[PDB]
Amino acid sequence: QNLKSTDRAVQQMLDKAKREGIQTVWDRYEAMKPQCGFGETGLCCRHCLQGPCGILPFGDEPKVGICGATAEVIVARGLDRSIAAGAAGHSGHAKHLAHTLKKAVQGKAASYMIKDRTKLHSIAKRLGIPTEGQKDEDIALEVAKAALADFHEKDTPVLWVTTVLPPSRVKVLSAHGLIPAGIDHEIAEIMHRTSMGCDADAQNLLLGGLRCSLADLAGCYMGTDLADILFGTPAPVVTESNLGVLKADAVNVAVHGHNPVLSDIIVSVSKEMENEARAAGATGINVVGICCTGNEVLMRHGIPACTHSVSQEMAMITGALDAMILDYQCIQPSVATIAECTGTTVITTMEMSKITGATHVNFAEEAAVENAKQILRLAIDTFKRRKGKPVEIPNIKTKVVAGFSTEAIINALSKLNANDPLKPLIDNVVNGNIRGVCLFAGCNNVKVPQDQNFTTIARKLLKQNVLVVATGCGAGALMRHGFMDPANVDELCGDGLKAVLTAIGEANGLGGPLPPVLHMGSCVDNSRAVALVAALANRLGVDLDRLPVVASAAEAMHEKAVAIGTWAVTIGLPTHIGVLPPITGSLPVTQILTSSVKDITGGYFIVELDPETAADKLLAAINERRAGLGLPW
Amino acid sequence: QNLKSTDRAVQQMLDKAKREGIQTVWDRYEAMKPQCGFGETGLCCRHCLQGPCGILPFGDEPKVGICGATAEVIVARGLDRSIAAGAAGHSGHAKHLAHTLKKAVQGKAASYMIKDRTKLHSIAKRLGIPTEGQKDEDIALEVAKAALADFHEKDTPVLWVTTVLPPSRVKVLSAHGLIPAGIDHEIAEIMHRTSMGCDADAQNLLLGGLRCSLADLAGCYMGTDLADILFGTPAPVVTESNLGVLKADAVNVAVHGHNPVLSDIIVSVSKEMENEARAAGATGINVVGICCTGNEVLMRHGIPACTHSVSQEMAMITGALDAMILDYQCIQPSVATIAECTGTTVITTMEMSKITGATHVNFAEEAAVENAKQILRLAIDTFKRRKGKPVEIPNIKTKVVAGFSTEAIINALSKLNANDPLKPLIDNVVNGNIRGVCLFAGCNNVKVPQDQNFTTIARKLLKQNVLVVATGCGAGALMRHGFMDPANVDELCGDGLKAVLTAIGEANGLGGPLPPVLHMGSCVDNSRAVALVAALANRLGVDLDRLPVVASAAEAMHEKAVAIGTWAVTIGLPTHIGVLPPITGSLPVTQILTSSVKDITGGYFIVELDPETAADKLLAAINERRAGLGLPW
Ligand SMILES: CC[n+]1ccc(-c2cc[n+](CC)cc2)cc1
Ligand SMILES: CC[n+]1ccc(-c2cc[n+](CC)cc2)cc1
Numbered sequence A, B: 001q002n003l004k005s006t007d008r009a010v011q012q013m014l015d016k017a018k019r020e021g022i023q024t025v026w027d028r029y030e031a032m033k034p035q036c037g038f039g040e041t042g043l044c045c046r047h048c049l050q051g052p053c054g055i056l057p058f059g060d061e062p063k064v065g066i067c068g069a070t071a072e073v074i075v076a077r078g079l080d081r082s083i084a085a086g087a088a089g090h091s092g093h094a095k096h097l098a099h100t101l102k103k104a105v106q107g108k109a110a111s112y113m114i115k116d117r118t119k120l121h122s123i124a125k126r127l128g129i130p131t132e133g134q135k136d137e138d139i140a141l142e143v144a145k146a147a148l149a150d151f152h153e154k155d156t157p158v159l160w161v162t163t164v165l166p167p168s169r170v171k172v173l174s175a176h177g178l179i180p181a182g183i184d185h186e187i188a189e190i191m192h193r194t195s196m197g198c199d200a201d202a203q204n205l206l207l208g209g210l211r212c213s214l215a216d217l218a219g220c221y222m223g224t225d226l227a228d229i230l231f232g233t234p235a236p237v238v239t240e241s242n243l244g245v246l247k248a249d250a251v252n253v254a255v256h257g258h259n260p261v262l263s264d265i266i267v268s269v270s271k272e273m274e275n276e277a278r279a280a281g282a283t284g285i286n287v288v289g290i291c292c293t294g295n296e297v298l299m300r301h302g303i304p305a306c307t308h309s310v311s312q313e314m315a316m317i318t319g320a321l322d323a324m325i326l327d328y329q330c331i332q333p334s335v336a337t338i339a340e341c342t343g344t345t346v347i348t349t350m351e352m353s354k355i356t357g358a359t360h361v362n363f364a365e366e367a368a369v370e371n372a373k374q375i376l377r378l379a380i381d382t383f384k385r386r387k388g389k390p391v392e393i394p395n396i397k398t399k400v401v402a403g404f405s406t407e408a409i410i411n412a413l414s415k416l417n418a419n420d421p422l423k424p425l426i427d428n429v430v431n432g433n434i435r436g437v438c439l440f441a442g443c444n445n446v447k448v449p450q451d452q453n454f455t456t457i458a459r460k461l462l463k464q465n466v467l468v469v470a471t472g473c474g475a476g477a478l479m480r481h482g483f484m485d486p487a488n489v490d491e492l493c494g495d496g497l498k499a500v501l502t503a504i505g506e507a508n509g510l511g512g513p514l515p516p517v518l519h520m521g522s523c524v525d526n527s528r529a530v531a532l533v534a535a536l537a538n539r540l541g542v543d544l545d546r547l548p549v550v551a552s553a554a555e556a557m558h559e560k561a562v563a564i565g566t567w568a569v570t571i572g573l574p575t576h577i578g579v580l581p582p583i584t585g586s587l588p589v590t591q592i593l594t595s596s597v598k599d600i601t602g603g604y605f606i607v608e609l610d611p612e613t614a615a616d617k618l619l620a621a622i623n624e625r626r627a628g629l630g631l632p633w
């Protein structure tokens, strides 16, 4: 049972679900085995009606597609479409945020406003939008219009690419034609070139995929920018994680998905419906988070992290989850069925993301408070239906210190050097106190036992003084196993890393160290790491592919994770992926994505499914980057 | 051997290829069997790294995806992505045309110009772009800017949707939220909603797919519009089809792909290099067409149709094909390999479409004549290498009368009624002389013996007085079996259809009838049929779903064909598809796409793999539409 998840509460709820005959994601995975060898090697194509075409990894015919598409062509086309799908997800997230900001500053959504004036000003200056002597709503409208225009061809390339990376990096990517012209333009061109009879050259397809991954990076950066403008830039905050944050005597409302435009309003309206909740016979409206919108409200408001990714269903298995408010992106549709057994009202709110069997509430920024009142009223009804009945909420919760936006990190460092905030960090990088930086990102994969790779690699990296930051469900796993709790620094961190964390934390008025891992936010907030990594780059006069910075999609599952890893490579990072991507069916594509892209961008993928070996490989990558700079290791 | 193709020349070249051990598409198809039952039923998903997930069509587990995605959800997501890929192809085609027009009228491409002033004026009037008292290049620039803007969100919806269908049809599609906001916007939203954890409601996904199919329709209409502005609106023309159009004593240059922006320049520059060809020891530069760019030059310049679709390789099997100029879209990459055995120089010209092993010439409208001179010089070299050596060009060619643009059709009808050109056609529809209209469209599929479905259904429809028009490789098949030759009217057409064709042809100054099938152009020129079908709609005061008009993707292969069939349904047509699409794995999705969409758009798919039964079903659909109007049948 410990082979399905390393989270103890998840094991408890798996026992409960097995008890009651509630089918789980691990059960469905067990029904799916043996899985198909063509697809999970990437050697399968259904790109037209002459298919499906499978190419045996080794042996006799079939060796080539019916139309003549080779193994590498098929592999590259599939990977390109994965990158495009992830880019579409992130880009639509940011597109909805841009629409919300425009509507707010045009007077069409009064529940939304400019909550971070300073970030709006700095973004407008970064884009060349004039701020001085201009109405705040005027420059916000201009910023939203620039964001919307970055989705198509225009006078300029994608500004959320070209103005967020150092100019030398932009030059390197422009010398290879990797700079995107428009986000949706790149997505459509990927869909065009990978369809039948089009592009059939592996190197060409992989370069196009790098461009599409940069479009995804632009989408992530824009989403972070607009969410910070509308809802505020996160600052350090203390909260709790895992299922134990649920309360049998409260109205449990879990916000699940990626777009915060809805759940941020939920967090506010719930406090106003506190009295209504009391009238129902409840202590209050206990709002918890699931997946990335949960991480957004965790970073901005200290909302507890109920659960993440592959184990989302386990929340409903408590029996005390009265509402699950879904927007889109990584909701298992199984919840809609599982609700029937758990007395959970599952509520979709977005037009392009509905699930069969769930109540739908058509969200609109013009009626966000109205929608939220209706939804939480349904949640109150659901609580009323279960008064006095038995629930099993595992009494398991960790302490989580989060809210480490790049702005907050720079400020906390400025406590040690007011005029050159990055200098203390670079100093400790030089003297060995900080070996390097690792970004943990991505989701949980049902094939990898939950949180095993993240915790294992994190332990091996922290004991060697790697400054570890995390986002999304990587942050979720590490926070559910105690890595955002400073009380574990002594157990987890090496001496130099402990000293650096202690120095910053004691300079930041909390008497103790920073938590062993810095939670940088959601899946799109990976852009935050870019913002940090580029900044240090600018401070050191070098390109990212010269920094001892690595990334780890240790348990990657989603197409967005593939796009994120691809643009982590593209901006120049060594990027470990801890699950097998569908590239092993063609040695040329694997060699390009792990070896020869070093000649193109300086980054490269590291495919390794053993977390001990993967941690050693990440350590070696960090140490080679250190050596290239002339640093001991 | 007749089981692989009904084209006699193709059978001859298949015998030659088998003789010499040249692997063919039919051979590769034979290596691919048995094909996978999950994919060709649509019951397979690889939309994230937890897959591949297969759902058995019948029996025990696996019954549901690992994440809980049902059979219908998986089927709808796959079909949605197919529609998006086809839309991306057509839209990128039209996008490149828009860029070429803008560059031409800004002074950046002197080889391109406004060749149809009248079509530019009428398009500008249809869009509300003011023509009166404006420079032709100014309104052309405005038209190109509107075309480019239709690819993203703006003040208005997609104008190439909303201004080309009758306003009642636009109202019907707007009542269901089917009107696209932007072409690339819709494509990206399809990629977003079909990725993991997003949309999981079959009806929702299919409605989104209808919207994306309308985006594809807009792309087709825009491509036709811009190609007509730059290169001219086709008029009737006489030429020849099949391999016999190749000449052993000429420099054989075959233009292959979809975008005419290149091959139209090739057609002109070749005549200027005629003297160079003579110097090489050749009679001239024999330019032939393959697939849809070949059909474009056939409709505009009377360039012979060498071959189409699944049999393209057979051209190289003649041994006398010296050059194959590929842009993109439906080129079998096998040609790049097959060239090594046939002495054929295969030349890619587009950045996003290269093939491993082929010479690449970077095309640019700023250097189109320069590129063309280089490419045809390589072709002359290739001819020089083969002087006096043996070739086998089958002496098989049919007569093809084509160039039937909607403008040309309206003019030919105006010969019978100068002020109400559509009235004679509607008159003969009423009195039974014309039973209905069938649009043949789409490609050849290696599973269906080549051209069998097209010819069979065409015979059964023509003998019952259906006015038959065709595009793309449907036109290619029907023209290679003699359906564009008026000399066959007596053999093919029923008495009333023969009388109508004879009346129009004798009124049009050629003493004989029109050909049994009206060639309306390329794959995007399906929009032409829309232009006709809408026009009659406007003349009759009814919606398309009330017209006795049907469509037939009789041997569909490409994702573009799926998108085309979907928007044929969406605008309200009964639409037969003659190959199995990946929808039969879910009865609900099949029922929606064949039965209940009648309540939504009035059109519906007809899935039938037997061409006799399919022809009967098309006949019955035409007759039901006749009955709804109160007409005998
Ligand atoms: C022959 C087709 N095929 C290729 C690869 C695998 C596979 C790869 C990695 N892992 C995790 C170690 C498991 C399975 C299974 C099947
Ligand atoms: C069980 C999986 N599966 C489903 C359908 C077919 C199939 C369908 C139609 N045709 C043409 C008549 C051939 C095969 C084959 C396999």
Ligand code: SF4
Binding pocket: A045, A046, A047, A048, A049, A050, A051, A052, A053, A065, A066, A067, A068, A069, A074, A195, A196, A197
């Ligand atoms: S595009 Fe090629 S490999 Fe893919 S299904 Fe079609 S014929 Fe097979």
Ligand code: SF4
Binding pocket: B045, B046, B047, B048, B049, B050, B051, B052, B053, B065, B066, B067, B068, B069, B074, B195, B196, B197
């Ligand atoms: S999205 Fe669902 S059905 Fe598709 S591969 Fe992932 S888990 Fe399987």
Ligand code: FES
Binding pocket: A036, A037, A038, A039, A040, A044, A045, A052, A053, A054, B036, B039, B044, B046, B052
């Ligand atoms: S045959 Fe298994 S993924 Fe296609």
Ligand code: FES
Binding pocket: A036, A039, A044, A046, A052, B036, B037, B038, B039, B040, B044, B045, B052, B053, B054
């Ligand atoms: S298992 Fe055959 S298409 Fe995926």
